[PDB]
Design an enzyme around this catalytic site. Structure first.
Site, mmCIF file in Angstrom:
data_model
loop_
_atom_site.group_PDB
_atom_site.id
_atom_site.type_symbol
_atom_site.label_atom_id
_atom_site.label_comp_id
_atom_site.label_asym_id
_atom_site.label_seq_id
_atom_site.Cartn_x
_atom_site.Cartn_y
_atom_site.Cartn_z
ATOM 1 N N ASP C 90 0.853 -1.185 0.000
ATOM 2 C CA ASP C 90 0.000 0.000 0.000
ATOM 3 C C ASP C 90 0.890 1.236 0.000
ATOM 4 O OD1 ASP C 90 -1.735 2.208 0.571
ATOM 5 O OD2 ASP C 90 -1.506 1.832 2.720
ATOM 6 N N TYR C 91 0.605 2.185 -0.890
ATOM 7 C CA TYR C 91 1.459 3.353 -1.083
ATOM 8 C C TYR C 91 1.711 4.169 0.194
ATOM 9 C CZ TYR C 91 -1.695 7.436 -0.761
ATOM 10 O OH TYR C 91 -2.507 8.454 -0.322
ATOM 11 N N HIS C 92 1.387 3.592 1.356
ATOM 12 C CA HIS C 92 1.659 4.209 2.656
ATOM 13 C C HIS C 92 2.444 3.257 3.560
ATOM 14 C CE1 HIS C 92 0.198 8.260 3.202
ATOM 15 N NE2 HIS C 92 -1.009 7.989 2.738
#
Ligand SMILES: [Mg+2]
Ligand SMILES: [Mg+2]
Ligand SMILES: [Mg+2]
Ligand SMILES: [Mg+2]
Ligand SMILES: [Mg+2]
Ligand SMILES: [Mg+2]
Ligand SMILES: [Mg+2]
Ligand SMILES: [Mg+2]
Ligand SMILES: [Mg+2]
Ligand SMILES: [Mg+2]
Ligand SMILES: [Mg+2]
Ligand SMILES: [Mg+2]
Ligand SMILES: [Zn+2]
Lengths: 99, 206, 92, 60, 82, 128, 155, 118, 25
Positions: C90-92
């Site tokens: 997840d881009y986080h």
RNA sequence: CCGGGCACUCUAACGGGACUGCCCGCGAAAGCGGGAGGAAGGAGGGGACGACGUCUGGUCAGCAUGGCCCUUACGGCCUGGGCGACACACGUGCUACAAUGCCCACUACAAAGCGAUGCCACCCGGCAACGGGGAGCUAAUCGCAAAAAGGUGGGCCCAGUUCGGAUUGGGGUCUGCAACCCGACCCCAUGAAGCCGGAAUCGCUAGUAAUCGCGGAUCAGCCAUGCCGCGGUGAAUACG
RNA sequence: CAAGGAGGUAAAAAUGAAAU
């Protein structure tokens, strides 16, 4: 000669129920050694406060098990008569033995 | 947030226990499991009564069980059933003195478990939650309460976005020890998930 | 050609065909991007509109990131016609 | 492996050392207190409930 | 380190002893290091399981307290980039 | 032979002090006030309240001690010695206050708190 | 931000002497909280003073401290990313602390074998004005001497 | 005195001087001089030649020590040469014998760090 | 030598007893 | 230890006990400084207690649960392996580099807790781990335990050395169906690196930091030097 | 005893981060 022991988790119920037996034995013809306060056996355990994984900062609990002793002299069936089956505990465990 | 269970926070002074028996080791484990299975079995076929408490007391094969209920309508006069084998079915894994009593909780609007349970029913009835919260609080406040507070959290009215609806009138001091604060909780099962209802009811003390 | 995996789910999906590491609705999506990262002879080929390709910044420099769906990223390092450290993050 | 795994925990045959503790309320195999027969998680829940006889907060 | 026990698998020995009268064939497997080297049937091969397959280990005296699986490494390693 | 109160406590240490009016400056318990406390420099500081008063050996010491270690016991003895001479000499109050020989000294070992390694010592960290 | 000016800690006087100073010295000797070993070493060294010189250690120790007292020390201060070093005066509290600290440190710097003989000798050397601590004291005053330029920054 | 293969330790207590031999250590030390009947706290400086002879005769015999038992120890490791076990391979690779942690540590057998970097 | 198994001090630290630390008397 | 006594100590149950209430000074008040008052003080020292909310923080692997997916299988049983792999990198630590130190012997002084499907006194064998016996204890009764730092004596004499204990060979014990991969001790012998730490970086303001041992949970056993508690001795400094 | 106006003004320290 008759030795009675009263264990309990709640001290207020113990300090009261084991005082009834001091009155119910004194007013029936006997000498009674009063509420002997045996030391408590504290049973602690420490649990991590979170279901996850936060090791630092938790919270612990304790299970205090109180002991109280009372001795009556002569085992006459006058005092025996009352303390025979006139029991009023809330679950308080009682031990009765003579030696 | 993070706040301690207002029941456990008392336990000693204010708010006594709910299962009052004494035992040493080799017994505590067995009797606690049985005790919890009683609570588990009762909750099932007695929910229609809406039980505020399930007090339990013991004294060597004595097992007393006091069921507090707003309306004990499901007891129906002696041999009118709803008690006979019902208080006797406990001793199918116990065999001890299944002494089952029934209490009449006077005002259900002052019993936190009952309040939260009434709210959690309404969530499953697909009611407007925010309005349901407001009413329940006032309803509790209408029946003489010194302070009240209801909390529903998560997935409100379905809709992808967990929310938290909040309402509280009067006085609710959780930090104080001489509090007499009743706490209740309920799971609302929905076709879109699960949400929790907290209910705080407060009266004076000193 | 893919040469290394940092995500165990992706790794099993491409190697053995085990889809129990990824989302069930994202099996076809994750497959067709991995195959495109495999047949890729240069990062320029991973430039189709739907991937939203772009090199990362900061401490993640040297890394690339095509998009599977939503906020989910297949991050890797592309060097000499091969991709390495394939991660489903997840881009986080 | 969870349902068939809380089976073995009570089944307890075949060598005495293969038997192990296991929370009853849950199915937790770790941090299981012998005294209650519960995991540290469940134990905390019920202690706040008040359903644990004598069990009380520790402050000193 | 046992002293009054000093045990070998009964099932390993059953298969090993009833195939020891006047001679045999080296075709003999197992599934347990647990055992011990066993004197007699020294000129034998015991295919020990290493977790993946059965490795034919050979006995030629020299070995004793070393049961079996010490002659059956379970890992591979082989090298670390070099 | 005689009796003079005695209740000295310091950091989990209990000492019952008597003193019997006699020129024999004596000891108690195990061996000598020496012997039992030899090699210990600050052990002889327990007899300082006697120096504060006019007691160059006018009493026969009798102090049964228990709990804690030597230093606390020695400290407790000081509180007991003073508690005796202030008891049977109520006018010897005007020296136990300016000199401060009369205090239980609530200074006791603080509890191990969770998270911390010991009492207050934090477990030390690096951000990276 | 030191709202309280932190009151000066007071000690217990020792045995045989009554010093309001010696115990402070024994404390610096003390490692790991063993006052027994600490006090013993000092009194041991006091017995050692009696041998090499016919002087009472209560003065030998006293004068030694007096000789290892920094009149003024250098203090790094303001403007320029704390670039300056203003030579400041030393408070009686601080002269006190530095004297005893430098004594014990210089004492354990000596090549001798026993802790007592190090203490005794370093005290005798310092009483004369010869000790390695006296070096340290005189050194700190050199630094304070060379900075009289921007001393007028003071404070 | 050239006791076994060594002679070195002069003025330094025979119970201690003995230690300076591969095979003696500390337990066999006092065990040897109580069985030979010699004062442990002696000078080691070539004292009574007789005590030295008896000591030498007992010590150098009895049990194996010095270069001879070094050879035996090395040969016991050579045991796991042939087609040896798992413990032999640990002597082969140069890694810890007792199955310990090798992810970190184990520097006493691996040797100083080599650093790969990547 | 808190880690040497041949001292009363190391035997304390380890907990166990033995020849270098007998079980009293 | 008995007779007997329970005033001391202790045990544990409710209470009393300071609220800057009293004195001087300052002030409009709040309050602040100072002083006899006492065990104690101007929230006495520590706990439990964590506002509205923030971090699309953490947790579908404690548990509950919407959706998706798997069902001769992504489920179920079993033996074996693996989580313990190692060219390396980082975190939190343990033991040290010694003489305010090490070794051996003797001899003291704790608290908080745990134990009769166990703790195991005292004898006996054994260098020891430990094994044979076997008394007491449903336990302020018996046991775990002698606390350790301390003291007294004696020995090393500053050298990788009686510092340091890694690594390795051999011999054993105990749990366990079994301890090769992977268990803890005991004994013999080996005795390494380290002689005090680069750039950087942490903790603590009073019983505190440092240092010393003791208990418990989990637990057949144990990789615990960890975590949660207990007491022993007990600093330094705060101008700002 | 209560400031209005005039003047000497910090350094070395750049960048952005990966759906609305
Ligand atoms: Mg931590
Ligand atoms: Mg401490
Ligand atoms: Mg390993
Ligand atoms: Mg390193
Ligand atoms: Mg508060
Ligand atoms: Mg997130
Ligand atoms: Mg789940
Ligand atoms: Mg792991
Ligand atoms: Mg070297
Ligand atoms: Mg050196
Ligand atoms: Mg502070
Ligand atoms: Mg730029
Ligand atoms: Zn559970």
């Amino acid at each position: 000669k008759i030795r009675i022991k009263l264990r309990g988790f709640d001290h207020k119920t113990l300090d009261a129920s084991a005082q009834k037996i001091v009155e119910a034995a004194r007013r029936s013809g006997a000498q009674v050694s009063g509420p002997i306060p045996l030391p408590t056996r504290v049973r602690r355990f420490t649990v991590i406060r979170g279901p996850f994984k936060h090791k630092d900062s938790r919270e612990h609990f304790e299970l205090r098990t109180h002991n109280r002793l009372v001795d009556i002299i002569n085992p006459n069936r006058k005092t025996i008569e009352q303390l025979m089956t006139l029991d009023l505990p809330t679950g308080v465990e009682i031990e009765i033995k003579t030696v | 947030g993070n706040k301690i269970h207002p029941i456990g926070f008392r336990l000693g002074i204010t708010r006594d226990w709910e299962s009052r028996w004494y035992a040493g080791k080799k017994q505590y484990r067995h009797l606690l499991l049985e005790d919890q299975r009683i609570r588990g079995l009762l909750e099932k076929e007695l929910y229609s009564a809406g039980l505020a408490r399930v007090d339990i007391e013991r004294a060597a094969d004595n097992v007393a069980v006091t069921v507090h209920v707003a309306k004990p309508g499901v007891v129906i006069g002696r041999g009118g059933e709803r008690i006979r084998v019902l208080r006797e079915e406990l001793a199918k894994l116990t065999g001890k003195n299944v002494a089952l009593n029934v209490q009449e909780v006077q005002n259900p609007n002052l019993s936190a478990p009952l309040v939260a349970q009434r709210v959690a029913e309404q969530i499953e009835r697909r009611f407007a939650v925010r309005r349901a919260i407001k009413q329940a609080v006032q309803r509790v406040m209408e029946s003489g309460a010194k302070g009240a507070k209801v909390i529903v959290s998560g997935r409100i009215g379905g809709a992808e976005q967990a929310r938290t609806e909040w309402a509280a009138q009067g006085r609710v001091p959780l930090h104080t020890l001489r509090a007499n604060i009743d706490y209740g909780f309920a799971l609302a099962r929905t076709t879109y998930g699960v949400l929790g209802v907290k209910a705080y009811i407060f009266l004076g003390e000193v | 050609g893919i040469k290394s995996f940092k995500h165990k789910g992706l790794k099993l999906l491409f190697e053995k065909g085990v889809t129990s590491g990824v989302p069930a609705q994202d099996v076809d999506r994750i497959n067709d991007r991995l195959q495109a990262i495999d047949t890729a002879t240069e990062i320029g080929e991973l430039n189709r509109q739907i991937y939203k390709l772009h090199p990362l910044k900061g401490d993640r420099e040297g890394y690339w990131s095509i998009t599977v769906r939503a906020n989910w990223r297949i991050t890797f390092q592309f060097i000499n016609g091969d991709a390495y450290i394939l991660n489903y993050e997840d881009y986080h | 492996a969870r349902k068939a795994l809380i089976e073995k925990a009570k089944r307890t045959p075949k060598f005495k050392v293969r038997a192990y503790t296991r929370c009853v309320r849950c199915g937790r195999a770790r941090s299981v207190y012998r005294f209650f027969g519960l995991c540290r998680i469940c134990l905390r829940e019920l202690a706040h409930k008040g359903q644990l006889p004598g069990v009380r907060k520790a402050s000193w | 380190s046992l002293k009054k026990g000093v045990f070998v698998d009964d099932h390993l020995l059953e298969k090993v002893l009833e195939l020891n009268a006047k001679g045999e064939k080296r075709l003999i497997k197992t599934w347990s290091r647990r055992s011990t080297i066993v004197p007699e049937m020294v000129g034998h091969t015991i295919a020990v399981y290493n977790g993946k397959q059965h490795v034919p280990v050979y006995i030629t005296e020299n070995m004793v307290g070393h049961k079996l699986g010490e002659f059956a490494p379970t890992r591979t390693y082989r090298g670390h980039g070099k | 032979m005689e009796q003079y109160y005695g209740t000295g406590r310091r950091k989990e240490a209990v000492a019952r002090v008597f003193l019997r009016p006699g020129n024999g400056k004596v000891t108690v318990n195990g061996q000598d006030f020496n012997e039992y406390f030899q090699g210990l420099v600050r052990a002889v500081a327990a007899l300082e309240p006697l120096r504060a008063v006019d007691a160059l050996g006018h009493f026969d010491a009798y102090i049964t001690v228990r709990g804690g270690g030597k230093s606390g016991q020695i400290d407790a003895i000081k509180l007991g010695i003073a508690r005796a001479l202030v008891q049977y000499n109520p006018d010897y109050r005007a020296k136990l206050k300016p000199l401060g020989f009369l205090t239980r000294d609530a200074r006791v070992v603080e509890r191990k708190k969770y998270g911390k390694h010991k009492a207050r010592r934090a477990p030390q960290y690096s951000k990276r | 931000a030191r709202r309280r000016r932190a009151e000066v800690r007071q000690l217990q006087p020792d045995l045989v002497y009554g010093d309001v100073l010696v115990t402070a010295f024994i404390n610096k000797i003390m490692r790991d909280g063993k006052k027994n070993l600490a006090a013993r070493i000092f009194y041991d060294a006091c017995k050692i003073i009696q041998e090499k010189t016919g002087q009472e250690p209560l003065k030998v120790f006293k004068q030694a401290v007096e000789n290892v007292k920094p009149r003024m020390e250098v203090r790094s201060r303001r403007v320029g990313g704390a670039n300056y070093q203003v030579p400041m005066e030393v408070s009686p509290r601080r002269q006190q602390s530095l004297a005893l600290r430098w004594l014990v440190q210089a004492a354990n710097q000596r090549p001798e074998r026993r802790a007592a003989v190090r203490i005794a000798h370093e005290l005798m050397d310092a009483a004369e004005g010869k000790g390695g601590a006296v070096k340290k004291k005189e050194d700190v005053e050199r630094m304070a001497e060379a900075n009289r330029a921007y001393a007028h920054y003071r404070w | 005195a050239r006791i076994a293969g060594v002679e070195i330790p002069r003025n330094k207590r025979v119970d201690v001087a003995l230690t300076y031999i591969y095979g003696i250590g500390k337990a066999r030390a006092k065990e040897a001089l109580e069985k030979t009947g010699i004062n442990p706290a002696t000078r080691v400086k070539d004292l009574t030649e007789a005590e030295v002879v008896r000591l030498r005769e007992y010590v150098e015999n009895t049990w194996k020590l010095e270069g001879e038992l070094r050879a035996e120890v090395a040969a016991n490791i050579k045991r796991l040469m042939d087609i040896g076990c798992y413990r032999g391979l640990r002597h082969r690779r140069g890694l810890p014998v007792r199955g310990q942690r090798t992810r970190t540590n184990a520097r006493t057998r691996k040797g100083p760090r080599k650093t790969v970097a990547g | 030598g808190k880690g040497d198994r041949r001292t009363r001090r190391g035997k304390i630290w380890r907990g166990t007893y033995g020849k270098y630390r007998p079980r009293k008397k």
